[PDB]
Design an enzyme around this catalytic site. Sequence first.
Site, mmCIF file in Angstrom:
data_model
loop_
_atom_site.group_PDB
_atom_site.id
_atom_site.type_symbol
_atom_site.label_atom_id
_atom_site.label_comp_id
_atom_site.label_asym_id
_atom_site.label_seq_id
_atom_site.Cartn_x
_atom_site.Cartn_y
_atom_site.Cartn_z
ATOM 1 N N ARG A 65 38.005 47.942 26.356
ATOM 2 C CA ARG A 65 38.721 46.865 27.047
ATOM 3 C C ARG A 65 40.546 47.497 27.139
ATOM 4 O O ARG A 65 40.989 47.674 28.216
ATOM 5 C CB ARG A 65 38.597 45.550 26.551
ATOM 6 C CG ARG A 65 39.676 44.542 27.129
ATOM 7 C CD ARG A 65 39.564 43.291 26.964
ATOM 8 N NE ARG A 65 38.856 43.043 25.573
ATOM 9 C CZ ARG A 65 39.439 42.883 24.476
ATOM 10 N NH1 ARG A 65 40.511 43.307 24.392
ATOM 11 N NH2 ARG A 65 38.588 42.506 23.651
ATOM 12 N N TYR A 121 46.992 38.484 52.957
ATOM 13 C CA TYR A 121 45.308 38.110 52.423
ATOM 14 C C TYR A 121 45.093 36.773 52.161
ATOM 15 O O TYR A 121 45.791 36.268 51.027
ATOM 16 C CB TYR A 121 45.246 39.351 51.132
ATOM 17 C CG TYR A 121 43.783 39.005 50.744
ATOM 18 C CD1 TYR A 121 42.721 39.513 51.733
ATOM 19 C CD2 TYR A 121 43.410 38.774 49.578
ATOM 20 C CE1 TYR A 121 41.535 39.304 51.443
ATOM 21 C CE2 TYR A 121 42.137 38.409 49.098
ATOM 22 C CZ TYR A 121 41.082 39.294 50.178
ATOM 23 O OH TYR A 121 39.811 39.079 49.648
#
Lengths: 379, 379, 379, 379
Positions: free
Chosen positions: C48, C101
């Site tokens: 991560r 968007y």
Amino acid sequence: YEGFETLAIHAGQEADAETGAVVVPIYQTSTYRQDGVGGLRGGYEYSRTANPTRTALEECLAALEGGVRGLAFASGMAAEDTLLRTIARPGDHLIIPNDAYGGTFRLVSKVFERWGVSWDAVDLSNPEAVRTAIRPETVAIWVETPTNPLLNIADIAALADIAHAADALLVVDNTFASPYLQRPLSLGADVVVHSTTKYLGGHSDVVGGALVVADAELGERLAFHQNSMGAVAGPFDAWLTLRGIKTLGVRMDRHCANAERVVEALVGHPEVAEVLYPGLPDHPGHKVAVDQMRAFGGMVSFRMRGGEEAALRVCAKTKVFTLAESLGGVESLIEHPGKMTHASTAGSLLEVPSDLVRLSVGIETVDDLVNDLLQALEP
Amino acid sequence: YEGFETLAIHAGQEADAETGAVVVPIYQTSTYRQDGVGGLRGGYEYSRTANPTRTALEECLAALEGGVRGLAFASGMAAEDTLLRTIARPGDHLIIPNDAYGGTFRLVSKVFERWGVSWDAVDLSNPEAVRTAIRPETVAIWVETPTNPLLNIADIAALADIAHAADALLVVDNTFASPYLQRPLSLGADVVVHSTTKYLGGHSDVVGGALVVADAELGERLAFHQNSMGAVAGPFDAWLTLRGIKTLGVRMDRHCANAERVVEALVGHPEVAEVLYPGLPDHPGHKVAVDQMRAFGGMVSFRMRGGEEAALRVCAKTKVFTLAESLGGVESLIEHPGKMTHASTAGSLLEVPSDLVRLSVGIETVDDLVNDLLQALEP
Amino acid sequence: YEGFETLAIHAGQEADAETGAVVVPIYQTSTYRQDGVGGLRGGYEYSRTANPTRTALEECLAALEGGVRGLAFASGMAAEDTLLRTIARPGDHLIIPNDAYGGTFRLVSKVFERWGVSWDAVDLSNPEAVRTAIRPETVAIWVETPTNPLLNIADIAALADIAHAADALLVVDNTFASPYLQRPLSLGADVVVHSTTKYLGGHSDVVGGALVVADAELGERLAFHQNSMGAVAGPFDAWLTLRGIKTLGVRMDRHCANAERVVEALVGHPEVAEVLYPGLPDHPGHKVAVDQMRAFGGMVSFRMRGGEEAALRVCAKTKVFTLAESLGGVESLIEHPGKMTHASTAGSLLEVPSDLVRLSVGIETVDDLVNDLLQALEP
Amino acid sequence: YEGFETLAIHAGQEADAETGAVVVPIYQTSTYRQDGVGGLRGGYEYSRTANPTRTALEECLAALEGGVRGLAFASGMAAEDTLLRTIARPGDHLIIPNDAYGGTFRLVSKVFERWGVSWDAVDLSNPEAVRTAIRPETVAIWVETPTNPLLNIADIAALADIAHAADALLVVDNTFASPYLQRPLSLGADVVVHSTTKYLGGHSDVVGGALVVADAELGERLAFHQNSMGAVAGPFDAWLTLRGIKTLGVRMDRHCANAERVVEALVGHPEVAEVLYPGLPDHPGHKVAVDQMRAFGGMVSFRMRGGEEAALRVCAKTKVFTLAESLGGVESLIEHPGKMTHASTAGSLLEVPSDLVRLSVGIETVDDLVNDLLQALEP
Ligand SMILES: [Mg+2]
Ligand SMILES: [Mg+2]
Ligand SMILES: [Mg+2]
Ligand SMILES: [Mg+2]
């Protein structure tokens, strides 16, 4: 009347029936539930026999070469092995090229000869030499055009008529040109062979092979060997190859344009004795290449005036071209066939000149590639 | 003195040198940069020849079977094909089992016989039959134990002494037992064959094969065919197989325990004529199985009193067991060999009884599997 | 002085140190062995936090946009969320586009407003409207150019000077243009946002996002949120995105050429009221587009004379263009923003006209795409 | 009445409808063809919103925890971030554990506090401390049990009654126990959090997270944030997590057995001051663990008599246990929380003792693990 670039994206690749997924799923499965014994769903039973991702690749390849059946394999070499195991038997004879991929030569001479298949290497650029080399036992003529690595040219339609007059098959290894530049089945070939490792996958990240045929019965005999010998492309590799195919047209256009510019930089460079490229008017077989190829490819070979020593120096000095085996990727590659890809042909009719360098010209910005070659060539 | 479960996780799988990544990377690459011509990095040059992810799988498999060299292939069948292409030539003879995977029979009888190899199917459970079947031309004895699908048992050490007295190789297809239950090289076998599609990958999601050998020279001859015929495992499939291997011990322990419970439910069930399982004391070759196997496996076969009609009904009625080809996955599978996996042996010495059902007992909760079989068996 | 297409293949992507693998491995790993406590290998500790495959993608993206730091995320939306969580706090204000968007609008209005961030939608094509809309609490101006779906144009350099005069950041969502056509950091932007799902991955087969920044300290604050919130691109998705990037130049060249031909077919078609494309001289902001864009993109929008009813009919009738959400793939896509991608902006300042159709013009053979549109437009 | 191990293989995982594929395909797709505008196939429209491979993982996880809805994320941390962004707003308060994953502490204290959420760390092993710590603004009690790294135990049912009396949610991070050992929703928890990076994926090769809920409306609010913030698990990672889940039962059985043996080797070892393991009768909260856990897990922590210096030496000396962050893989891992995973809690109520070592006991052969620890502990 659909165009090549449309077929490369769509053929074999209708959206998924259940979900509409616009990309073929990766069917990472070995087996398939049946509805009662023999109640197949969609015709699937076991992935070595057929896998839906591999089917999409096989159908796409068949569409692009204009064949009835495509078959995908674990490598180009595995495609060649399954082909020859299907069409030959002990006592048969093969005509092979006098300049060819070293692995083809090794498979024919070091495995199939032990298994009772005879062979001769012939200059396929001379139809009269091929016609003359036919024997009563000849089952196939194996053609590369352009050849690996000298880029010599063979007239596919002419050789198809010779093969068929002898009741033999014409096999064309169409790896270097790809289906976008050359379509051997349209010129009478019986079988097309690819290493999909090269231009079809296009990204130096999958090893794979394919066969495409015109005749459905030969396709069934090859599929029987695909299943029984089991040298299949796995679904993830098949899926990456298919992803690569979607950009073959735009990649090949750029490989050809960049290779033409590289040829211009090499021709007349004082360190370079000879440039091999099908697009040069004085290249042997240029007029045949013009007939049968949309454009002349991304591969360029050349000989160094200072011999092997100079060729080895150029190969170590490039900073953009990478020194490695293989070809047909986005990335530019350089090698010395004599000591790398074609060390396996040393001592045979297929031995390559020791002063030769082979380039796979990639799709990087062309001035970077020309500048890299020019500094590497500087003594 | 490291234990099996330790080796399955660690052998071939040291953490990455540059980054420490504790899992082997997926080397999805076709080629490798050289430092000058022939200056290989870490010995890599081209992925068909060797790939680092495939190397880790090959090294792990060699450790688990106690061999010197492992080789990974595109399928079990491709492992078998590369093996036979290496060790046989026209004029040679093979002894094969009288009960075997249909694909083995098909490869030997329908491909290799055409290529000049003779064969005989023998009862490998009878050493005196194997000894007697040796011919001057016999190059190998091909053993499955337990056999697919009847689960008959062959004494590996006894057959190794027969093979070696005839200067022949002993080949053991160790797919059903896996390295966790049986280690043929330790009993004198020359070559171990696996379909890694089955218990080694373990999750019905990869088709793959492997060879492991005791002798380094035979390993080099097989590797020459691995490279030259090219029927290699791709790196992603190799990586999933290796992931599966990490849980082989715990999966196989549960397959064996669940299969013992399923056997208890089938023995004496009024619809069941016969139960085939190596662990039953009256199973032919039980004492040999006790000698050579850690436990008796996840496979269970049985014959229906009401014949083929009853067997086909059971196969369609299970709701937890899935009707499909294949075996060795976490998920339970059922099939009818006569019409599914062994339709290819109909009409031969290897024909299977039409009243037989084969189970691959998975690792689901055992009461669910017993209850599913009991409702499927109810007329 | 390396060119874009060279950097797309090589930046972040030196051959592997140990093996020479020419393609970045897929580091499908969660963790990394340390040599003693804190003895990191190559700086890796936990995926991560950083993963070597994700690093190669991040370094490549930074090179292509000319930034100091790239960061890859699980989706475009996750890139946007991590950005806004880093640069805003309760009480702050954002200027967003008046055409954008739908997911950007939804994230700002339906999540961040609840969390105490105010916002206004502004016509970014009018610098004087943006200047006027600055508030004392404004922390960023969020720019799309061209906008999704009307393809309106914003002068990045002009808006950068307005943002910086207000001690605010300029954020440019460069998804539609890609780094190949437009480089906002070179015009004063502070942050570039991408949905790599679109043109960068290029094959409609990966959902992913990215950020690229000019300032290393802002890059460290964003990386702290990348690690702590954990909305990272996984290594396989990162690897496919990077594979896609290698052909961005050749794909985008063909998208632009094919879109110019599609525009020619739509302009003056009797069923088409208006064609929206930055390359049309009378398109609002054409001269700004000429200044800041290498070419005008693959997106084309148009309004139907017969209204929503006609637009819905066209969208259902195409046979080559696929009716689906998304954009920027090799394959051509069509949609109706009003009912599909922009149903989430109905009732707001960002509501799209109901008679509009949006095309993502792909790289199929252009005559097939023109013919498909012409039959779909026929009443 | 299906059992856990059956559900782990079958739930969400019916064979494919079209092909029968027994394993869920990898839907490596961004988008889906619609049949007319809004005509979804199988309910799919865009992969961030839902993807069929991610759906199978989400449905499986919901079945295993007995919830109505599962949601998969890019990492455990992303699951936590989406949860807290959904259920909290500025002005709210959280109760968190006084011993917890450092990333949980970092997300709450360093991101959410900046965004206006207050918090307190409480001893969750003392119900009266949790009851007392409720504030009017408390929205959730966040529970780990066993805690990371001290393995302290919290009575889930008792804490659920406290949370619900305060109209607050009970969140249980069930990462360490997994669904196989502990089912918090069955004891009144509202939300279960996992890092699937750990035991669920099980092979140290995927970073991922999940949420499972009992209430469908909370599930819809979380799914709105999953879509809008976009921190989703990609399909390939989701597919590997699901593959891992298939062996959770057999892996966890072996982790628990091997951890019990390791505990026996550590207890009374003259270098070891204290052993932390829920299964030891004198471990704080042992009787609660017996109530709520099927078995006591694979994690074992212990303190060194010679302090930090001795703990750092042990961590560097193991040859089978690998020194790395993370846990829950097949492979054994060791670390020093003070300087590795919990350096982020230094200076807080969650600071870990400097003399502590944490083990993730893997599934290697137990004598190899005991012998490795015993040589590492030898001064
Ligand atoms: Mg279909
Ligand atoms: Mg190593
Ligand atoms: Mg490097
Ligand atoms: Mg289904």
